[PDB]
């Protein structure tokens, strides 16, 4: 086409979606990870994760307001990944890299799994 | 912080949100523009438009599944702007620039209003 493009549009959209999350505006699901609860937007979860994409395209699960993750999933690892979904920023540290990689493999977040594998290989 | 960043994350998120829109997945509102109907995600509309942000943060309007725009709003201008919201791409042409600018001013999409003003000034 003959379209023009606004370079910062996608980043600005994501920034506003994170502002809505921080204010709990139009969140439509709670993700339960052991004792911890995380509120989010189903559409953002699907856009970032192969696991959530599969869950919320399911004709029955699409209507659930609560999703319980596998008890092996670490709440901190999930928190770091949820923050990444809404910001593009990953808080990857020596002390959390194993929990982050395991959570990203479960959530099917291929690019995060790739950077965790590379950072582990370097050490 | 000591975060790393995935450059393409915001663009990839927006691409997936547009895929959900094209398949009518988790759309939660219909925007009525004269005789025309447009399905969308309230969160994406809010993230892109000052008008939708104000509408869906309203304690009563946040629950509406149908929003009717002012009858002066042109359906094609709205369609071009809705496409821009989900893609960062604006189909700005000589034949639509006046309707696009008027719709962007009504929707409170400041960056689109700015490029329309600049393109009109050049001609």
């Amino acid at each position: 086409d003959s379209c023009i493009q606004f370079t910062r549009h996608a980043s600005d959209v994501l920034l506003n979606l994170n502002r809505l999350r921080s204010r709990d505006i139009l969140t439509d699901v709670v993700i339960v990870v052991s004792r911890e609860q995380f509120r989010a937007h189903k559409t953002v979860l699907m856009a970032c994760s192969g696991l959530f994409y599969s869950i919320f395209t399911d004709q029955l699960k699409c209507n659930l307001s609560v999703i319980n993750l596998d008890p092996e999933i670490n709440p901190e690892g999930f928190c770091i990944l949820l923050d990444f979904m809404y910001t593009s920023r990953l808080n990857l540290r020596e002390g959390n890299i194993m929990a982050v990689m395991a959570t990203a493999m479960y959530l099917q977040m291929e690019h995060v799994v790739d950077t965790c594998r590379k950072f582990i290989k370097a050490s | 912080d000591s975060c790393i960043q995935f450059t393409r994350h915001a663009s990839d998120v927006l691409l997936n949100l547009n895929r959900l829109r094209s398949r009518d997945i988790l759309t939660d509102v219909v925007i009525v523009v004269s005789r025309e109907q447009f399905r969308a995600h309230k969160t994406v509309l809010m993230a892109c438009s000052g008008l939708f942000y104000s509408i869906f943060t309203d304690q009563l309007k946040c629950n509406l599944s149908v929003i009717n725009l002012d009858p002066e709003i042109n359906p094609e201008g709205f369609c071009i702007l809705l496409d821009f919201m989900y893609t960062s791409r604006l189909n700005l042409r000589e034949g639509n620039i006046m309707a696009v600018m008027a719709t962007a001013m009504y929707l409170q999409m400041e960056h689109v209003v700015d490029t329309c003003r600049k393109f009109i000034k050049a001609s």
């Binding site: 379209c3 023009i4 493009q5 606004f6 370079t7 | 791409r89 604006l90 960056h111 490029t115």
Partner: peptide, 4 residues
């Protein structure tokens, strides 16, 4: 704004 750019030409994509």
């Amino acid at each position: 704004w750019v030409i994509p």
